[PDB]
Design a protein around this ligand. Sequence first.
Ligand SMILES: [Mn+2]
Ligand SMILES: [Mn+2]
Length: 242
Amino acid sequence: DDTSSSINFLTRVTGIGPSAARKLVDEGIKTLEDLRKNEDKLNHHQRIGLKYFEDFEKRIPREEMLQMQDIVLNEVKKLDPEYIATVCGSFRRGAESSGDMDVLLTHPNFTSESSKQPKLLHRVVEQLQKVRFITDTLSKGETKFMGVCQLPSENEYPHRRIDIRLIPKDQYYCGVLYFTGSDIFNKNMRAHALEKGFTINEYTIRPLGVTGVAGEPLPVDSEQDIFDYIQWRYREPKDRSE
Ligand SMILES: [Mn+2]
Ligand SMILES: [Mn+2]
């Protein structure tokens, strides 16, 4: 009812999951002013979401993402040019506006065999924070970081969501592909690959076999190699709507 209407509002909060939104109702937390008066019931994540609830509802204009991406890129280069960093999402596809910035990141040092190099990501984050670009963190794993950022005012920008992922270099490409979408796109493509006897995922492309349950990741060094294995002309991201 007008109360279910309540849980619906909660979940609008980044961090607030249903079961998590639910209990807060059983606590008599419904509107938002409720929540502000009740930070203590919330985790760091949720607190942040709450913190930026408004802004988080606003969309990112690509004139904005552009500058974002430049900042992110120039910072990572200065730390180690051997760093690969690509802003994926519809944004990559040319989208006129975006919801959040999401950066895929890699390094040759780091590969699907290593698997343990937090410092790799961390250093970036830190450099970003030092920059005053990242501004808060919702969470922050060895391999992933979700947070907030903001362009630099000279006089102000909204705070945006940002995600940074660390992928082993031998998996990066697929991943870039993958986070590039669109979803149909991925779908049609894995579909195709399959015709051609190949199985793709966000991590790797693999040849199938008899009975079907098969594989063993082919080497990828670019998105192109993906398309090449499946012998499909290469689609630049803009041409990826489907
Ligand atoms: Mn995202
Ligand atoms: Mn703001």
